[PDB]
Structure formats: C-alpha cells, structure tokens
Design an enzyme around this catalytic site. Structure first.
Site, short mmCIF file in Angstrom:
data_model
loop_
_atom_site.label_atom_id
_atom_site.label_comp_id
_atom_site.label_asym_id
_atom_site.label_seq_id
_atom_site.Cartn_x
_atom_site.Cartn_y
_atom_site.Cartn_z
N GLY A 120 55.31 51.66 37.97
CA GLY A 120 55.43 50.62 37.47
C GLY A 120 56.59 49.68 38.13
O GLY A 120 57.31 50.93 37.85
N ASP A 124 63.07 49.47 31.88
CA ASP A 124 62.80 49.42 30.44
C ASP A 124 63.76 50.26 29.56
O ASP A 124 63.98 50.28 28.86
CB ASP A 124 61.48 49.33 30.26
CG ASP A 124 60.65 50.44 30.03
OD1 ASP A 124 60.98 51.65 30.97
OD2 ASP A 124 59.59 50.73 29.26
N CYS A 132 52.60 51.53 30.79
CA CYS A 132 51.57 51.87 32.45
C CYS A 132 50.97 52.80 31.54
O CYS A 132 49.46 52.10 32.32
CB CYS A 132 52.57 52.69 33.47
SG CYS A 132 54.09 50.83 33.62
N1 SAH Z 1 56.96 61.34 34.78
C1 SAH Z 1 56.99 60.74 35.44
N2 SAH Z 1 55.55 60.73 35.85
C2 SAH Z 1 55.33 59.76 36.82
N3 SAH Z 1 55.84 58.70 36.62
C3 SAH Z 1 56.65 58.23 36.88
C4 SAH Z 1 57.48 59.36 36.18
N4 SAH Z 1 58.22 58.65 35.48
C5 SAH Z 1 58.43 57.61 36.00
N5 SAH Z 1 57.51 57.19 36.68
C6 SAH Z 1 56.91 55.96 37.02
O1 SAH Z 1 58.07 55.22 37.56
C7 SAH Z 1 57.67 54.00 37.24
C8 SAH Z 1 59.02 53.18 35.94
S1 SAH Z 1 60.22 54.27 34.58
C9 SAH Z 1 58.84 53.02 33.02
C10 SAH Z 1 58.74 53.13 31.73
C11 SAH Z 1 57.39 52.80 31.46
N6 SAH Z 1 58.14 52.38 29.70
C12 SAH Z 1 55.86 52.98 31.30
O2 SAH Z 1 55.18 52.92 31.16
O3 SAH Z 1 56.15 53.68 32.63
C13 SAH Z 1 56.77 54.68 35.60
O4 SAH Z 1 55.87 52.95 35.42
C14 SAH Z 1 55.71 55.15 36.77
O5 SAH Z 1 54.75 54.19 37.61
#
Ligand code: SAH
Length: 185
Positions: A120, A124, A132
C-alpha cells in the site's frame, strides 16, 4: 550494509499500490514520494533486483515526484509507473497477487518467484486500520503480514517493507532482514 556476490535479477514483481492520494495531506504525500524514491534506490543496489511497479500512479504524488526529482524519475530503471490499477495491470495473474497488510490473519514466510507482492502506497501512521486488508478482500486477493512477531512484540513504512522484502531475497532469513532495517538497537 555490504553486498556480497553476483547480481541476479529476480522474476518477482513488487507493486506500489498508489490508489490512496485522496486519503493523504500534503506532508504525507511528500513523505510517500521520498519513500517511493527509496524503494527504487534500494532496488537498484539489491543483490536480486525485482520489477518495481507503481499502479494508479498520478495526482499529487506524480506532481510532487516530478517537482522534487525534476524529471529524474523518467530515468529510473526496473521501474514501471502506470495509471492502471494493479488489478488491471495483472488481471491474468490475479491468482498470483498477494497484498501485504499488517492486519492479515495470514503470515508470509517466503517470497515466491512467480508471485506479485503489493505494498500500500500510503503514509497514514496506520490511522486507516484495515484499509489495505479491506481492499484486497473485496477483490478476492490473498493478504499476508510480515513474520515480524515474535521479534517485534508493527506497521512499517512503504520503504521499510520494500527493503525487508528485498533483503529476504538476498539472505532468505527474516531475522537478518529485520536486524538490518529495524535493528532493536
Ligand atoms: N507488518 C506488516 N506486514 C505487511 N505489510 C506491512 C506491514 N506493515 C506495513 N506494511 C505495508 O506497508 C504499507 C503502508 S503502512 C499501512 C497503513 C494502512 N493503514 C494499511 O491499511 O495498510 C501497507 O499497505 C502494507 O503494504
């Protein structure tokens, strides 16, 4: 970080899903743009570069990018921006899509050479919980969270996640990738 050995491109596609322009203020867009650039830079030096896609690419992100980079983005390699959604661009490979989300019930344990991993493209601070996860479920696409627990004990930035994936290709060891990108200190 030092890189050892022969550079061998991976067949993996990694997609930055840039469909969330309207959810971000100006500072957040600015930050995202820096993060997209870091994904390209980390990819360029990677032991196994992938094909980087930026889908639904446009709006304030695309403007900001060209403002900051002054047309340099048009020079990037292994980089594929498109106004098409990932669903449009990879319709025939829909079964091979995996949307990475911290909110998934599922955990990724290996990156598959024939799969296409989506990040994503949004800054945010996770105020949009389940964003996502919800999007990918509605499309019928599988989701997976990073195997962060139990060395984490959660939501990383776009470039941190990219960097971790890329380092996994090199090391095939999640602990090393985490230690490099998010050392406990
Ligand atoms: N622990 C995790 N596992 C998998 N993907 C992650 C993650 N942390 C962040 N991401 C990735 O990093 C991106 C940005 S952070 C995401 C913020 C958002 N609230 C959301 O719903 O995804 C995410 O969309 C995801 O693709």
């Amino acid at each position: 970080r030092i890189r050892l050995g022969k550079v061998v491109p991976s067949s993996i596609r990694i997609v930055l899903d840039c469909a969330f322009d309207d959810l971000m203020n100006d500072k957040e867009i600015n930050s995202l743009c820096q993060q997209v650039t870091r994904c390209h830079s980390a990819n360029r030096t990677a032991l196994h570069p992938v094909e980087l896609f930026a889908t639904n690419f446009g709006g304030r992100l695309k403007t900001r990018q060209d403002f900051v980079l002054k047309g340099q983005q048009n020079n990037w390699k292994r980089y594929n921006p498109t106004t098409k959604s990932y669903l449009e661009e990879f319709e025939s490979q829909k079964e091979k899509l995996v949307y990475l989300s911290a909110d998934s019930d599922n955990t990724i344990t290996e990156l598959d050479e024939d799969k296409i991993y989506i990040i994503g493209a949004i800054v945010d601070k996770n105020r949009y919980k389940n964003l996502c996860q919800n999007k990918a479920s509605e499309q019928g696409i599988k989701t997976a969270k990073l195997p962060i627990d139990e060395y984490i004990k959660k939501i990383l930035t776009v470039n941190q996640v990219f960097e971790i994936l890329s380092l996994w290709l090199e090391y095939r060891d999640w602990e090393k990738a985490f230690m490099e990108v998010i050392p406990k200190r």
